[PDB]
């Protein structure tokens, strides 16, 4: 069932959100926000800069002070507020999915059934953890009583990408708030709108002021201000590996703030000759084409054993030739645009390198349409390991298919990258499934599927795809700071 908004979407929230009130930019400047499917301007939004990040950090710092409502309320009540926020997003699901689709160039069907559902589910997951964050009592040597407090870290700067604006907003603020932190959020310049609507719901739910502050603006300005701020305790960033290196450097340069990074990938699939071929073709297809290829986990190197390689390529090409391009709000449309011009150019450039460097073009290979940043879905076969399309993250609807004959060699090829976000193994052999997944240097390894991500799982990269993990039990560790308290006593007993 796909319900829709019956009235025209109205844009209301366009300002900076600090202390639960709406602020104009200190400068007074605004910046435009566009629809990627028509290239038209949707509205203007206050452009946050350093001076505005500064106001937001002071509010988050004040809300984090010992004795404050956010520090003294029951953990169970932090969880209650998060579950109420999820309820409010459920109530506004139609308008949120519409705004996300319109602003993000995201198929409305997916925005409604996947993004919004994942936002609600992840918030509810995080809410349940709030009063279950616990320290230890420890049998230290000597006559002492030792316990630990897993405290919130403090003020957390959180820089959100444009490919999944709502899901990634919730993946950031959910755990941070559950653990008792306060946050300064910087949504992507391309997609500030849905985060500002959620800010309106954070007010409605009753979060104390300054617990969540949202500062739209640009990366090199507001994002850099966060990463270099001397009173931000931790920065979490999701985006390119190139910016991730800059975030980590600025943290070292300023105040040694803690850093979590969720970065790009060049994630491989290994399809053994004994695999369920149709199952592997479909999971690897969606694994690389999902959201116009704009997933960091994109299955952008697909290695197929020689004896099924040609059959795999044909079936992949047939699947890719079935899309309907156009406005992601129209029912039946199955591929929307890329997010903006910068990404669009890099995709087309990489596609050209595939042609020149000798990859076999099976379908697609060019732009589409009169308006919008549309790229034809493209499949390359006979890709080799030193081609650009095999080394660089494309972030577009561009599939690479490679042949292998030796299992030892293909694992080394799969691992021969600086990336390491995810991988897939397709086989019917129990031993191969366990040993290959163990040997891949990747944060998530899927067996006989791809792209399966849920709130209960930790998620993050090996190597240059990331530092740290998000979600699951394990992800919640990086939103606490562990304090050891050791008390002298006359005599301990076990």
């Amino acid at each position: 069932d796909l319900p829709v908004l019956l009235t025209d979407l109205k844009i209301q929230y366009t300002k900076i959100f600090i202390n639960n009130e709406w602020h104009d930019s200190v400068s007074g400047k605004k910046f435009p926000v566009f629809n990627p499917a028509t290239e038209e301007e949707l509205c203007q939004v206050e452009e946050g800069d350093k001076e505005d990040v500064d106001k937001a950090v002071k509010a988050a710092r004040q809300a984090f002070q010992i004795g404050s409502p956010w520090r003294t309320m029951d953990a169970s009540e932090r969880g209650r507020l998060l579950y109420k926020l999820a309820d409010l997003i459920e109530r506004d699901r139609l308008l949120l999915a519409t705004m996300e689709s319109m602003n993000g160039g995201k198929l409305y069907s997916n925005a409604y059934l996947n993004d919004l559902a994942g936002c609600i589910k992840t918030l509810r997951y995080c809410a349940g953890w709030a009063d279950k964050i616990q320290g230890r009592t420890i049998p230290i040597d000597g006559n002492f009583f030792t316990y630990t407090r897993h405290e919130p870290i403090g003020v957390c700067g959180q820089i959100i990408p444009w490919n999944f604006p709502l899901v990634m907003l919730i993946w950031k603020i959910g755990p941070a708030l559950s653990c008792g932190n306060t946050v300064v959020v910087k949504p992507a310049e391309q997609t500030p709108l849905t985060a500002l609507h959620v800010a309106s719901l954070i007010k409605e739910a009753g979060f104390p002021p300054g617990v969540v502050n949202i500062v739209p603006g640009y990366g090199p300005t507001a994002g850099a201000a966060i990463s270099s701020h001397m009173d931000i305790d931790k920065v979490a960033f999701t985006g390119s590996t190139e910016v991730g290196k800059l975030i980590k450097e600025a943290a070292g340069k300023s105040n040694l703030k803690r850093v979590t990074l969720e970065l790009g990938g060049k994630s491989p699939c290994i399809v053994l000759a004994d695999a369920d071929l149709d199952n592997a073709v479909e999971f690897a297809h969606h694994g690389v084409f999902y959201h116009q290829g704009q997933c960091c986990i994109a299955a952008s190197r697909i290695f197929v054993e020689e004896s099924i390689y040609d059959e795999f390529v044909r079936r992949s090409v047939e699947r890719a030739k079935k899309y309907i391009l156009g406005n992601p709000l129209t029912p039946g449309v199955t591929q929307g645009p890329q997010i903006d011009k910068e990404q669009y150019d890099k995709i087309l450039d990489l596609i050209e390198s595939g042609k020149k460097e000798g990859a076999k073009l099976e379908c697609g290979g060019g732009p589409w349409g009169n308006k919008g940043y549309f790229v034809q879905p493209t499949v390359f076969s006979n890709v080799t390991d030193e081609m650009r399309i095999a080394k660089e993250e494309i972030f577009g609807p561009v599939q690479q298919i490679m042949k292998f004959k030796s299992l030892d060699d293909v694992i080394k090829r799969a691992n021969n990258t600086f990336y390491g976000l995810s991988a897939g193994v397709f086989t019917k052999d129990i031993d191969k499934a366990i040993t290959i997944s163990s040997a891949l240097q990747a944060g998530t390894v899927w067996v006989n599927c791809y792209g399966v991500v849920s709130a209960q799982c930790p998620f993050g990269g090996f190597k240059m795809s990331g530092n740290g993990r998000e979600l699951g039990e394990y992800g919640f560790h990086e939103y606490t700071e562990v304090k050891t308290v050791t008390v002298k006593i006359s005599q301990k007993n076990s």
Copy 2:
């Protein structure tokens, strides 16, 4: 009981340790190693540089390969090797304590009864964790079987300081090896000797070659090579906050390697009027003077309620006037030298700032002796919060004593620093002990004691005193990399 070595100490191990064999420096260069209590040269050691770190990373990488002995042996056997290494250090305790004291300027009594005991105990603690590192099975949404592997990260560069060369060597390699990593260790330029002897014992114990590689040399050369290396997965550094910022920046600049930092402090004590005064005087005294003040946790700001301030100052001064300076090997000597000239100059300079800026000099305040980097134990009273001796880490035998009258104000003063390693609270009030320890922004808070550190406790800093934790259950997390494995199944059941 204080047994001693009956024969003259002989220095044997002076070379670089890679793949369980002894290497000359690629350059062929050596550097001198001195005794800080006499300023004489003890021996020469091969000077590792980038080319030597390079050989060590390739050995650690090869030892980490899937299928290798270190990757395939039982976790219980990793633990067995660590317990055997502890046995071997116990066997060589006399010579190790002598070498540590001679090279490190460290009171032999402490070297034998505390450093060596802590090395043995921490190794035995870490050994017990090896086959108890576990992942999860997770009830993910949908028809999937999801488990996690807490794998070793890989090759870990570990830069060891000179104030506790053996303890910090073991605090680094213990957890790293227990979790299955391989390491490239860089001991301090001042104190390479005891780490090279332990390397000889790692060979004897039977660790596979390349699991532990030790490259003596200088910070700006070998240490920088580690921090910027493109095939080191994680760097752990203990030392100054200034170098810590450089380590973190170089990690961001190169390969986004994971970073753990244990840095300096300006740790405060708060002594309430109802405290056991003698107990507070003695714990705070040793808290700041231990190992000639060369502890990152040094209790270098001591705040005393006005009505007991003068009594606290007198009793502190009497305790400080009781030391016997000289060679740390002679029995009855109770204060050895500072480690080297650089540290010695910074201490004397800061002591001079105390005189000029108006602190009340109660005892000490100058150098001592014909030879050795000796500083008189010094006490300053009437210290105020913007003096240099109240803001900068001294790392010398220099005690600061301050008065307070308001508890709200003194907590803000205690927290008004970029440091945050530790703190102490001295009181008989149950509520004050809990609420004050909760409000201090410090990684370890001691109640009615100070400086109590043990293998069972996590240990690390808030703010610019550190990133991450070492030891305890929680410290072992930062030597694993979490992989999620998600398997498609026909139907799951709870």
Copy 3:
């Protein structure tokens, strides 16, 4: 704020609840249900017996089968259903609190503000755990992949007491359902009504049929049928220690079903001479008098240091002389009746033993009123350790106050019982608070408070006060059954 039901309470749900439908008793027999404050009959309820427990076990067994909706739905959805049930109880809070007060003889103010709030909060706590129940991956010796599943146990029989019918219903079904079990609940013969209303809400919330089955009836009949049933996997019982022994024996005799027991107590308080005297008097007063003394944790032995004993006794007596007895529905009433005649007789008998055995009667000591099972609030001083009122659980509004002079001796006296549910320590001394709480053989020890119980804490007895724990992280273990799965593989890697 104390809102009330504006309309007369109507009783609707009076039948056995199996497979989400209402059943008459197999026999066709019903039993009466009374109001303890007027001794009048409120209604009749179907009397479940063995044949009815049998129907309920078969339904719970079928609902637990592999492939069933309850076994295959996402853990997150089990949690969702529990949070919806909490929402429904919130909606029906007025009628539930009224029915609980009317049926249970429970002060309406407490029923509304404490019992109902605790029901809602505990359900919400348990809901959060559902998709956070996890097993392990384990580095077993040899070439194997080993993981564990923390499965639900299966069909759990749950026998609920009459002193807190709703809270204890939720403390049982919350964790059991969160972990994926199915249940057969047997509410107290005295108080079946609120559990049957909740059953109506379990239907409304959408739990699959047979996941929760509720069989009202008598202990020796339906309760014994559960404890001896050959296809019930686990029994949880809260009630007297005498019945607890019978439950455990019948489990051994039949099918070795798992057993959790939450039983009575004779819990002690130790009030040191340095205690906040008013704080100790008030917490110990409510600790023994709460809900007409009908708490298993009742603070029924209060030991006071000699020098403050007389002052403690006077202040206690003044507090006890302030109650207003009567119908627990009338505002301003502060003490309702005992639950029934059996309990009423045992209370009066024990009160008489206090008079005869030489206790000093300070106030109360007899019955009250024309109707209802009312007991005057009673205080005994000069109680000695071999009196009946110091050894046997009274479960009535009867306070015992004892003198001590030696701390070693009073701890031995506190521990000299077969019970061990809880205890309290009142002191301003940090060391005494830690060492005394460590030395008491009791499941919960309160320091400078009493009776503080919350969903985040494990709760249960030492010794003959109980087996196992309920709630908290730790309580959830006893609603899982751990399965180890060990898979042969060609070669493992860490």
Copy 4:
């Protein structure tokens, strides 16, 4: 390599062990101890009875008192003593393996390479846990500080079986001592000798007196005394399900002591048509024949898909026809005797029922030899589900092989028992391996192997095969008692 004792074994330790000293029985009576391979008497041992269990409980109680050496020593030192005990057993491995083989009728090769190795490894595993047993700090509702202590329970009675006397002794005392308990051990009447030698090593290692007390004697006398004792806090029993029911009943009848039970089984294997047939034949063969079939996990129902059934039966029969019966000390001997006459008679009786009830006798079926309790290794094919040999635990070298054609049906057959200790699944299908292991009601499920047990894994039964788990992280829970400590504070902060 199989080294042997060069000198005749001398029996020295034959008395009751209490408070680290050797006691004669209160009665003065002794009982004989036999060799099962020759039926000759090896020595006499003091016969412990109730009066002797009484002396042992008082010693264990005194050793558990608050302030005692065992209660106050560092947890790390409890671990140290356990690692030293493992060292001492390693030193005495030859004599211990000889005594175990001689007393137990156990193949010396297995006694040396498996039993003794498992004793040493399990002790070392348990030692590592000692200072890693931790409670929690908990964010309770309201202004309170709440922590938990995972205390030792207290005095634990431990009844050890005769099939693995040393391994099961260590599986019991290892975790109990690691957690800080004191124990009263009752080795099997048939095999007291190796436990008394270990007691001598517990003295040598330096355990405080009364921490371990060992009372040889008979089940209905000393074992019943333990199970009914009013001052034993917990009983752990391994043995038959029939005695397990009596242990659990006596616990309920006396003092509600905690109970852990490791009982028998009728564990099934399911061999799918796609299995590695040779691998399944060998693992299932050893799974049922190990230690003359005297394992509770014996794979005593083997279900094989029809199309490979005949091939499976032939290959099994060939493997069973390869044993050499005789004295388990002689090299090359591969099957020793059953433990005693009672077990020997039950085995032969059940074998006769197989003949009469219509099972196809493939080999064996009778006794062997002039002396010793020897049974020919026996294989039955065409076994059906209501035969005695398919329902009752045989505990002898008797293999049952069954045919199945329907997977749904064979899982129901596998689960159609009151037992539930373990099971095996043999297949090459990933989905079948996961779904079948999930659906089996068994505590350990092996995939493509059988009988793989190690210290890092929890181990125990579903249903009437057991209550609770031993070893692993999870097994250590049942040797602690959780105490919640809740402290009133003026204001909490997260």
